[PDB]
Amino acid sequence: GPSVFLFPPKPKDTLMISRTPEVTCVVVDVSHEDPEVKFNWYVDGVEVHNAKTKPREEQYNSTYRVVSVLTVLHQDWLNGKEYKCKVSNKALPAPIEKTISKAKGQPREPQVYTLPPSRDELTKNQVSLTCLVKGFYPSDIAVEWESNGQPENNYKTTPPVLDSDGSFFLYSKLTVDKSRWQQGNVFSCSVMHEALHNHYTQKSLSL
Amino acid sequence: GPSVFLFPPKPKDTLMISRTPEVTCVVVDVSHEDPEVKFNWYVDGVEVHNAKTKPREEQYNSTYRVVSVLTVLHQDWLNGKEYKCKVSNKALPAPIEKTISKAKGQPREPQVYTLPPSRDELTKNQVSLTCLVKGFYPSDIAVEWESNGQPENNYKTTPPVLDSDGSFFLYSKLTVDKSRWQQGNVFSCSVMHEALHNHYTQKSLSLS
Ligand SMILES: *[C@@H]1O[C@H](CO[C@H]2O[C@@H](C)[C@@H](O)[C@@H](O)[C@@H]2O)[C@@H](O[C@@H]2O[C@H](CO)[C@@H](O[C@@H]3O[C@H](CO[C@H]4O[C@H](CO)[C@@H](O)[C@H](O)[C@@H]4O[C@@H]4O[C@H](CO)[C@@H](O[C@@H]5O[C@H](CO)[C@H](O)[C@H](O)[C@H]5O)[C@H](O)[C@H]4NC(C)=O)[C@@H](O)[C@H](O[C@H]4O[C@H](CO)[C@@H](O)[C@H](O)[C@@H]4O[C@@H]4O[C@H](CO)[C@@H](O[C@@H]5O[C@H](CO)[C@H](O)[C@H](O)[C@H]5O)[C@H](O)[C@H]4NC(C)=O)[C@@H]3O)[C@H](O)[C@H]2NC(C)=O)[C@H](O)[C@H]1NC(C)=O
Ligand SMILES: *[C@@H]1O[C@H](CO[C@H]2O[C@@H](C)[C@@H](O)[C@@H](O)[C@@H]2O)[C@@H](O[C@@H]2O[C@H](CO)[C@@H](O[C@@H]3O[C@H](CO[C@H]4O[C@H](CO)[C@@H](O)[C@H](O)[C@@H]4O[C@@H]4O[C@H](CO)[C@@H](O[C@@H]5O[C@H](CO)[C@H](O)[C@H](O)[C@H]5O)[C@H](O)[C@H]4NC(C)=O)[C@@H](O)[C@H](O[C@H]4O[C@H](CO)[C@@H](O)[C@H](O)[C@@H]4O[C@@H]4O[C@H](CO)[C@@H](O)[C@H](O)[C@H]4NC(C)=O)[C@@H]3O)[C@H](O)[C@H]2NC(C)=O)[C@H](O)[C@H]1NC(C)=O
C-alpha cells in the first residue's frame, strides 16, 4: 500500500544557528484498514530516538497521511551525515527505507558580481539592478537585496542553474524607480551559503 | 492500465516557418493482454484525422509504448487553438483524454538587455556576458548567443521566472575566454518570442 517521501531542511535553516533545520518523512496511501505506521530513523546508520510523529490526517481518497519530523544538528547536516527514514506497516512485504543528505561533494564559494542597468533600459521609468552569483556548490543558497541599511524587497531571484563545470549560478534582479538609481543611492546584493566566511557576503552596486 | 502524456511543440518551432511544430501524444504501460491502442485527435473540439501514429513498440519492461504525432500549423498554435489527444484501450474503464494549448493571457514583448562583465571578474581566465530578457508573456521563448555569425555554445539560460507584474524574465549567461572579450570581439544575444516583430530580435555586446 503506502508510499514514502523524505524532504530536506531549507537552505537558510542549515546556515543560521538561530533556525531549526528539520528532515520530514511523509507517508501517503495509509489505508483505514492498516493505520499503524512505525518510523525508525538513523543518522549514518545509527538509530536515533528524537523524531516527532505528528497525528495522522484523513485524505480525501480514503487514506491517511502520517508525518514524522527529525530535527538535525546544523554541523551534522553540513558535514554530510545521511538521514534514513524507515517506514514499517502491516500492508508492506518489506519495510520502505529512504535516505537523504546534503548534496555530496566539495562546497565551493559563490562569486558575487553586481551589474548596473543597461543604457538601453535607462529609457524606462524602472530599471533592473542585477546580481550574478556563480561558481557555487552545493545549490543551497539564499539571496537578498538592501539599500542604506534597509532591506529592498522588490526583487525576484532565479532558481540555481547547473553550470558547465558542475557548480551552480543564479541571477537576482532588483527593480527600482529610475530616479533612485540616478541619484547615486547604493544598493547591495546579500548572499548566504555554506562556503562563505560566516556563511555571508555582500556586494554593493551604485551609479 | 496505460498512462498518457501529451507534450507541446518547442517554442522556436512555433515561431520559425522553416521548422515544424508538433504535439506528441505518448501512451505507455500498454499490456500484452490488451495491446491495441486507438487515438482520436481534436482541435478546439473538432475531430481531425491527420495525425501520424507509429506502430506500438515493446519496451524492455515488456510493456508497449505507442506515440501519435500531430503536426500543427504555426499560426494555429500561436492563435491558442486547443489540441486534445483521446486514447482508447480495452484495459481502460473509459478513454483517457488530455488537452494542451499555449498559455492563456495577453502577449507581451520581451525587453532584451546585454550587460558586460563586472570588473571584479576581470581577474579570471573566463568572463560572464549577461543577457537579461524581461517583461515577456507567455513564458515560451528561445535564446541563443552568437559571435561572427557562428553560434556560441558555452552559455546557459535560466528558466523563465514569474515577475511581480505577471510577466516573465530570464537571464542567459555566456562564458568566454577573457582574451576574446579583451580583443573587442562582438557577441550577440538573440531572442525569439511571439510578441517580437518577425519573432526575433538581437542585442550586441562588446568592450568599450
Ligand atoms: C491520495 O491523496 C494524496 C494526497 O492528496 C493531496 O494531493 C492533492 C493532489 C489533492 O488531491 C489534495 O486532495 C491533497 O492535498 C496523494 O498523495 C500524493 O502522492 C504523490 C505520490 O503518488 C506525492 O507526489 C510526490 O510529490 C513530490 C513532491 O511533493 C511535495 O510537493 C508537492 C507539490 O509540489 C506537495 O503537494 C507535497 O505536499 C510536497 O510539498 C513539501 O512537503 C515537505 C514536507 O513537509 C516540505 O518540506 C518541509 O518544509 C518545512 C516547512 O514547511 C520545513 O522547511 C522542513 O524542514 C521541510 O522538510 C516542503 O516545503 C514541501 N514542498 C512544497 C513544494 O510544497 C514529488 O517530489 C514526487 O515525484 C517524485 O515521485 C514521482 C513518482 O511518484 C515522479 O513522477 C516524480 O518525477 C518524482 O520522482 C522522483 O524524481 C527525482 C528526480 O527529479 C528522483 O530523485 C532523483 O533521481 C534521479 C534519477 O535516479 C536523478 O538522478 C536526480 O538527480 C535524483 O535526485 C526521485 O528518485 C524520484 N522519486 C520517486 C519516488 O520516484 C511525487 O510526485 C504527493 O506529494 C502526495 N501529496 C501530498 C500532499 O503529500 C496520494 O497519492 C493519493 N492516492 C492515490 C492512489 O492517488
Ligand atoms: C516501462 O518502460 C516505459 C518506457 O521507459 C523507458 O526508459 C527506461 C529508463 C526504462 O524505464 C525502460 O523500460 C523504458 O525503455 C516507462 O515509460 C515512462 O513512464 C513514465 C510514467 O510512469 C513517464 O513519466 C513521465 O515523464 C514525463 C516527462 O517525459 C519526458 O521527459 C523524460 C525525461 O525527463 C523522457 O524520458 C520522456 O520521453 C519525455 O520526453 C519528452 O518526450 C516528448 C515526446 O516526444 C518530447 O516532446 C517532443 O519533442 C520533439 C523532438 O524530440 C518535438 O519537439 C515535439 O514537438 C515534442 O512534442 C520532449 O522534448 C521530451 N522531453 C524531454 C525533457 O526529454 C513527465 O512530465 C511526467 O510527469 C507528470 O506525471 C507524473 C505522474 O506519473 C507526476 O508525478 C508529475 O508531477 C507530472 O505530473 C504532471 O504535472 C504537471 C505539472 O504542471 C501537470 O501539468 C500535468 O497535468 C501532470 N500530468 C498528468 C499526467 O496529470 C511523468 O514523470 C515517462 O515519460 C515514460 N517514458 C517514456 C520513454 O515514455 C514505463 O513507466 C515503464 N513501466 C513500468 C511498469 O516500469
UniProtKB/Swiss-Prot annotation, chain A:
Q: Which UniProt keywords apply?
A: Adaptive immunity, Cell membrane, Chromosomal rearrangement, Disulfide bond, Glycoprotein, Immunity, Immunoglobulin, Immunoglobulin domain, Membrane, Secreted, Transmembrane, Transmembrane helix
Task: Enumerate the GO terms in the molecular function aspect.
Answer: antigen binding; Fc-gamma receptor I complex binding; immunoglobulin receptor binding
Q: What is the effect of changing residue 86 to A?
A: Does not affect binding to FCGR1A. Only slightly affects binding to FCGR2A and FCGR3A. Impairs binding to complement component C1q. Impairs complement-dependent cytotoxicity
Residues annotated as glycosylated: 61
Q: Which residues form the Ig-like domain?
A: 2-101, 110-206
- What is the disulfide pattern of this chain? 25-85, 131-189
**Domain of life (superkingdom):** Eukaryota
Keyword presence, Secreted: yes
Q: What, per the annotation, is the impact of changing residue 122 to M?
A: In IMGT allele IGHG1*03
How is it modified post-translationally? Glycosylation on Asn-61 is required for interaction with Fc receptors and ability to activate the complement pathway.
Region called CH3, residue ranges:
105-207
Q: Where is this region: CH2?
A: 1-104
Gene Ontology cellular component annotations, sorted alphabetically = blood microparticle; extracellular exosome; extracellular region; extracellular space; IgG immunoglobulin complex; immunoglobulin complex, circulating; plasma membrane
List the GO biological process terms: adaptive immune response; antibacterial humoral response; antibody-dependent cellular cytotoxicity; B cell receptor signaling pathway; complement activation, classical pathway; complement-dependent cytotoxicity
Query: Subunit comment for this entry?
Result: Immunoglobulins are composed of two identical heavy chains and two identical light chains; disulfide-linked. Interacts with FCGR1A; this interaction mediates IgG effector functions on monocytes. Interacts with FCGR2A and FCGR3A.
Which disorder is recorded?
Answer: Multiple myeloma: A malignant tumor of plasma cells usually arising in the bone marrow and characterized by diffuse involvement of the skeletal system, hyperglobulinemia, Bence-Jones proteinuria and anemia. Complications of multiple myeloma are bone pain, hypercalcemia, renal failure and spinal cord compression. The aberrant antibodies that are produced lead to impaired humoral immunity and patients have a high prevalence of infection. Amyloidosis may develop in some patients.
The task this protein performs is described as:
Constant region of immunoglobulin heavy chains. Immunoglobulins, also known as antibodies, are membrane-bound or secreted glycoproteins produced by B lymphocytes. In the recognition phase of humoral immunity, the membrane-bound immunoglobulins serve as receptors which, upon binding of a specific antigen, trigger the clonal expansion and differentiation of B lymphocytes into immunoglobulins-secreting plasma cells. Secreted immunoglobulins mediate the effector phase of humoral immunity, which results in the elimination of bound antigens.
User: What's the protein here called?
Assistant: Immunoglobulin heavy constant gamma 1
Source organism per entry reads Homo sapiens
Which taxonomic lineage is given here? Answer: Eukaryota, Metazoa, Chordata, Craniata, Vertebrata
Instruction: Write the gene name.
Output: IGHG1
Full-protein interval shown? 120 to 326 of 399
Swiss-Prot record, chain B:
Disulphide connectivity of cysteines: 25-85, 131-189
Name all Ig-like domain ranges. Answer: 2-101, 110-206
Q: Which domain of life does this protein belong to?
A: Eukaryota
List the Gene Ontology MF annotations in alphabetical order.
Answer: antigen binding; Fc-gamma receptor I complex binding; immunoglobulin receptor binding
Q: Which residues are glycosylated?
A: 61
Question: Where is region (CH2) located?
Answer: 1-104
A biological process (GO) annotation for this entry? Answer: complement-dependent cytotoxicity
The record gives the effect of mutating residue 120 to E as: In IMGT allele IGHG1*03
Phenotype for residue 86 to A: Does not affect binding to FCGR1A. Only slightly affects binding to FCGR2A and FCGR3A. Impairs binding to complement component C1q. Impairs complement-dependent cytotoxicity
GO cellular component, alphabetical, reads: blood microparticle; extracellular exosome; extracellular region; extracellular space; IgG immunoglobulin complex; immunoglobulin complex, circulating; plasma membrane
Task: Using the UniProt annotation, give all residue ranges assigned to the region (CH3).
Answer: 105-208
Question: Which disorder is it connected to?
Answer: Multiple myeloma: A malignant tumor of plasma cells usually arising in the bone marrow and characterized by diffuse involvement of the skeletal system, hyperglobulinemia, Bence-Jones proteinuria and anemia. Complications of multiple myeloma are bone pain, hypercalcemia, renal failure and spinal cord compression. The aberrant antibodies that are produced lead to impaired humoral immunity and patients have a high prevalence of infection. Amyloidosis may develop in some patients.
Instruction: Say what the protein does.
Output: Constant region of immunoglobulin heavy chains. Immunoglobulins, also known as antibodies, are membrane-bound or secreted glycoproteins produced by B lymphocytes. In the recognition phase of humoral immunity, the membrane-bound immunoglobulins serve as receptors which, upon binding of a specific antigen, trigger the clonal expansion and differentiation of B lymphocytes into immunoglobulins-secreting plasma cells. Secreted immunoglobulins mediate the effector phase of humoral immunity, which results in the elimination of bound antigens.
Protein name per its UniProtKB record: Immunoglobulin heavy constant gamma 1
Which organism does this sequence originate in? Homo sapiens
Q: Which gene encodes it?
A: IGHG1
Q: Which residues of the full protein are shown?
A: 120 to 327 of 399
